[PDB]
A = this chain, B = another copy of it.
Amino acid sequence: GKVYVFDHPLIQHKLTYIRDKNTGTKEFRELVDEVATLMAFEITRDLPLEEVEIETPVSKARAKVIAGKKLGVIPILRAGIGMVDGILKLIPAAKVGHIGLYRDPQTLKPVEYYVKLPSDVEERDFIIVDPMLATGGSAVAAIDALKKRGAKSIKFMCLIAAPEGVKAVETAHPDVDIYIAALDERLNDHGYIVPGLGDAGDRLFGTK
């Protein structure tokens, strides 16, 4: 599918401090939440409009309201929770589901481990969120997880992504669009995005 880069100068600005190694855990946490809300605005620019008829204190009028559709925000444990409340600010109605993944010794990919979703799965559109899209491993497992439960609308959103990871998602799931804030250049032997921002989880929780 297509990848959308959100280049708003405010996102770009906050992203810079998010990357800087000197930004402590508290600022990091707060900055990600902010960039999360900002991207939520850009992404929801799609929401279908239906027009009703209201009546202001002056006269009647033809206004518009949001189409009426169910939304689902699903963070990938653990660094994923860092971007939920930010999105929930704009869409308080959206339901929140979580997904855990485990990794085995001699394997090349993560695997579904813990899944909790809202019961109306078949109906609502979902947005899987995770700060980093590296090898695409965790993202793919997560989407496979959702498709298996029958959600037919899946979008992925992250701050920073690596080419390989984007390709991994394209290949495995061409029907899923990707929303990123920046596309870095590559991965290193340990799987970190370069230049990236280090370990999202540690920077967020300030703990292991």
Residues on A lying within 8 angstroms of B by beta carbon are 8-10, 12-13, 15-16, 19-21, 38, 41, 44-49, 52, 54-61, 63-66, 90, 188, 192-199
Contacts and interface: CB of A to CB of B under 8 A. Distances in A.
A62 to B, nearest CB: 8
11 contacts: A9-B46, A10-B47, A12-B49, A13-B47, A19-B56, A21-B55, A56-B198, A58-B188, A58-B194, A58-B198, A60-B195
Contacts of A8: 41, 45
Q: How many copies does the complex hold?
A: 2
Nearest to A44: B10
B9 A56 contact: no
A16 B57 contact: no
A39 B13 CA distance: 18
Nearest to A182: B63
Contacts of A197: 56-58
A8 B10 CA distance: 18
A195 B8 CA distance: 33
A20 B55 contact: yes
B66 A19 contact: no
Contact of A66 (B10, B45, B64, B66): B10
